[PDB]
Design a protein around this ligand. Sequence first.
Ligand SMILES: CC(C)CNC(=O)COCc1cc(-c2cccs2)on1
Lengths: 167, 170
Amino acid sequence: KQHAFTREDLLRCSRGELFGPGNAQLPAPNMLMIDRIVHISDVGGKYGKGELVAELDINPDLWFFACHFEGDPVMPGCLGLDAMWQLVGFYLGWQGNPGRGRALGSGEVKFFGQVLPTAKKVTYNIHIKRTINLVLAIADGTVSVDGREIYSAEGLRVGLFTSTDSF
Amino acid sequence: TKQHAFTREDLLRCSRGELFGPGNAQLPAPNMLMIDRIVHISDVGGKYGKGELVAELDINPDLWFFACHFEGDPVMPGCLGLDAMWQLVGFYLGWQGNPGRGRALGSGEVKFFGQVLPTAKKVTYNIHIKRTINRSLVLAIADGTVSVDGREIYSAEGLRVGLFTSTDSF
Ligand SMILES: CC(C)CNC(=O)COCc1cc(-c2cccs2)on1
């Protein structure tokens, strides 16, 4: 029903309190790689099967700049990638499906730019390609920094797992 | 290229730029460093006859990510096991004696089909080098798998990492 979420909405999700116990949670800091969801719907997008647009605000004091790497700070790609998985999981829970979320993998992933600590904002664009009903979603995603496209991922997969679902 | 294993302190020295020198490959420091030790690294043998790395990360409930991922449902993030494999392929490139800073370039298929719970003992990475290209930029292509206490849980085909004597373009 709701098409945008604030950081507090996301934190409430991370405690299990948005979609309920046993259903999809975002991670909490410092794994949470999203500050807000600017748009989420289940129509339109590249494939007509939905879209998310999310943001993460950047400043030099974010933890990962210190350790990755000393004398050469850059946001880790894996974390931008996980953002995209986090977002596809959120989608599944937001649609009203039950169960806990797990990334199942992707096809191609490409990194061709970087998020430096002089950046202002990272934006994720996720396009849902298919939902299969175990319940799972396939999407493409890109990551951008102050307007500039830097990562891409094809065929991101996230599944949801109930009481009766095992890895 | 002489040394075929590294301790955690070797890896921490690498992370400060002090194993391979300034401007060459570094591992990340904690809490992004996802390896405790490299048990075997060589540039012959492996699946493809072009080299192999075997590395370990020790698991205990205390590791930071278990608290936040997720509350009431701790599990190691897959992205971090993935990054371990990139981190390792970068180390290989520096260990071969090439210059420049490392950047993950991407991969083909990745599959997650198991998980690391905080009751696990040890995660093990096995990386097989498929190709190193030295033609203009220096880069590596490898397959990898991740295992937890003997059980294979992730796979990655076509991991790519490059070295850059000049990243300024990105
Ligand atoms: C898909 C093929 C073209 C790979 N792409 C390239 O050749 C372009 O350069 C790679 C690059 C990567 C990064 C980052 C890596 C990790 C965090 S940021 O910053 N520049």
